[PDB]
Amino acid sequence: MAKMAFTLADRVTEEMLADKAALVVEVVEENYHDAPIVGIAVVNEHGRFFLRPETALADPQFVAWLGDETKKKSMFDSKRAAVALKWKGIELCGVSFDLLLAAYLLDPAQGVDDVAAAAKMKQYEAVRPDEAVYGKGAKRAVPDEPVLAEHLVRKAAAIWELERPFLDELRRNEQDRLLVELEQPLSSILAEMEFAGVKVDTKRLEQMGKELAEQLGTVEQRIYELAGQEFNINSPKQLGVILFEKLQLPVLKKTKTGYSTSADVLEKLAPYHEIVENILHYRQLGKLQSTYIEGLLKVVRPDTKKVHTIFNQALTQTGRLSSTEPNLQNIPIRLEEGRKIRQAFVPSESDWLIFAADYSQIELRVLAHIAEDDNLMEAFRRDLDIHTKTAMDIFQVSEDEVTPNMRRQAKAVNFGIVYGMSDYGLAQNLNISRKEAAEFIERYFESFPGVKRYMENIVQEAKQKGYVTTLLHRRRYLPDITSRNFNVRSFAERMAMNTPIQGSAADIIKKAMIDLNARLKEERLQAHLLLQVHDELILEAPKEEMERLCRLVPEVMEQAVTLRVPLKVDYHYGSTWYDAK
DNA sequence: CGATCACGC
DNA sequence: GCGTGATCG
User: What is the 3-state secondary structure (H, E, C) of A341-391?
Assistant: First the structure.
């Protein structure tokens, strides 16, 4: 009666197939793609059951219950179960409550990664953290059946008990529809995207691998010639001894252990010595090689030549997705050498093409909407180039008098407003003075007084309410907004300024993903989502569908919500992700 | 591990 | 502002 009672079941019975249940389909491998299911727990009105998966998943009655939309299941991290079951050809339906997503909407700062941490939010402690049962990292093991089954039954019993109070609190926060109509349906869409995966041209990556390895070997040798000795170019310390001690280059910035060797600093040092540009080029090549070529080839499935990312839907403090193993949300684009990596991401079938649609300036259009700044809203109703226009306003010039440097500076100020940075932050970002950065910000606020009002009002609202919200009622708690430490307080103020913009942008693209999946099914298109990259959706479709996607994808993305400004989506397609430009 | 740096939006 | 991850020591 400190132990939890359950049937360790040999076969599946009708009692286990009630039309409401807490279900655990446990996948212990962090990467759940084609991973084993180690055990199953069901808690329902009839009691508590553990089933061995070779039993339950081979039983036609259990499989049909899993697939029955009208048999409602409460889970934690239903996507993990959904995907592991997809790899076994088994459909999971009727998941009406996901505790991971419920806890994430109530408070993203909790970092709820297991049932125990979700349960601790409601004073429920009759369940162990996964880490205590499985261990961590290397020592990490499925334990023997009696320990495993008791753990899964306790997770299920916790889920069974916590559904009601999580749903009550979401309802009080007006997040009930954010759970049921946004995050849960998106969960199933991410499952499909992860499972379908993205085809890679591994031969192209291998060949890029070879060219890079030769170029690195060249640039390595040059570096040791200019330094007149061998060292580890990747040692943050050994590089600092070569640059600042042997060659005696000026120290323009320190960090902690010693000297900054960031690309910011190295660029300023290039004139002093021919070693610096070689070091910068070497780092560029080395990044492509380590992170992108070798990293990608490590996780490609040799049988299909696909990568299967995992979108973490319950991690970011703003409501964005993250992407792991591999991260397909940070593939190079800015420098042409890196951008060529995208030539290796190809359609998964013959005569298919990659279709990429991205929102134009979604953060600043969202800012124009929430601030109701008359001038910024007008700028977007004219579809002006927003950086050119901010330049005309802050420097008091006509369009024709805006220089490339003015535009670059106006662009950085636009980012500085969205990130809520201080004079210091903008000065650091622009390599200018603080008094200067403050004149820019003051002039911006004179051109956009509604944005100034919004920035002041949202800091005061975070202080008064304890949190800030997005368009679709996502929340972030900011307790540090009342700290008497200036740096901790200022960081909370920037989050109060930024989170509604970045979070509202995340809300809109998630709704567009839901609306777009429904429209593709209605339209009988084979086109499907592969990736989301924050303000961008990537699909693949038969070439015969491109003409329809050119009208449908932007339309659905533009109409996902109605703001006081239009939403604008650009779109391109081609043979590879690279060519979808 | 955590500090640093480099990639994305 | 928000992320992942390769690397060193």
Answer: HHHHEECCCCCEEEEEEEECCHHHHHHHHHHCCHHHHHHHHCCCCHHHHHH
